[PDB]
Amino acid sequence: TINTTDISTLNTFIALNLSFIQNIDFKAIELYSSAEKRLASS
């Protein structure tokens, strides 16, 4: 009499190794600095 854990167990899983979607934070950007905007007031 022995434990069932000692007996090797085989498994048949075709591993559906997925890959989820990471989350990015969209940094707000701009082209022309406010200093240049003032310099363009002329």
Q: Which residues would be at the binding site for another protein (CB under 8 A)?
A: 32, 36, 39-40, 42
Neighbours of 8 (CB within 10 A): 5
Q: If you ran DSSP here, which 8-state letter would residue 22 be given? A: -
26 versus 32: smaller Cβ distance to another protein: 32
17 versus 41: smaller Cβ distance to another protein: 41
Residues 32 and 42: their CA atoms lie apart, in Å, by 16
* Least spacing, CB of residue 42 vs another protein, in Å: 5
3 versus 41: smaller Cβ distance to another protein: 41
Residues 14 and 11: their CA atoms lie apart, in Å, by 9
